[PDB]
Design a protein around this ligand. Structure first.
Ligand SMILES: OC[C@H]1O[C@H](OC[C@H]2O[C@H](OC[C@H]3O[C@H](O)[C@H](O)[C@@H](O)[C@@H]3O)[C@H](O)[C@@H](O)[C@@H]2O)[C@H](O)[C@@H](O)[C@@H]1O
Length: 106
């Protein structure tokens, strides 16, 4: 969970308190306009054809790097796992934990 050397996007930290799912993401500043979303499987591990979606927003700079921070926070009915989807300059990038996805306990 460091400022990456080359990864296009990298989840840093996340929390789920029973209702609110939130976190912070390193995002390479490839171009100005960006869409950063969190796509998740619900409490029964249902990915629902990528239809469970939270929009992240720009949080702040990481000066001296080529990265910036984005954050998210939203209510969910339940969550077992998720990945980050990042669209910028006409291409899609993922942090899906090298295909394992990121897990939420319980
Ligand atoms: O709907 C309004 C929108 O406005 C802010 O978002 C700004 C901006 O955030 C992303 O871009 C990052 C970009 O923002 C600043 O201008 C910095 O100067 C840049 O260095 C930095 O790269 C996004 O890609 C843009 O489309 C967006 O306009 C709020 O932060 C948003 O929450 C809010 O939705």
């Amino acid at each position: 969970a460091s400022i990456p050397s080359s990864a296009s996007v990298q989840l840093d930290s996340y929390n789920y308190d029973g209702s609110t799912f939130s976190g912070k993401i390193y995002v390479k500043n490839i171009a100005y306009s960006k869409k950063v979303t969190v796509v998740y499987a619900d409490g029964s591990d249902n990915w629902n054809n990528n239809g469970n979606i939270i929009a992240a927003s720009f949080s702040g700079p990481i000066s001296g790097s080529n990265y910036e921070y984005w954050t998210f926070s939203a209510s969910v009915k339940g969550i077992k796992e998720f990945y980050i989807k990042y669209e910028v300059s006409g291409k899609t990038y993922y942090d899906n934990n090298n295909s394992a996805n990121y897990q939420v306990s319980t």
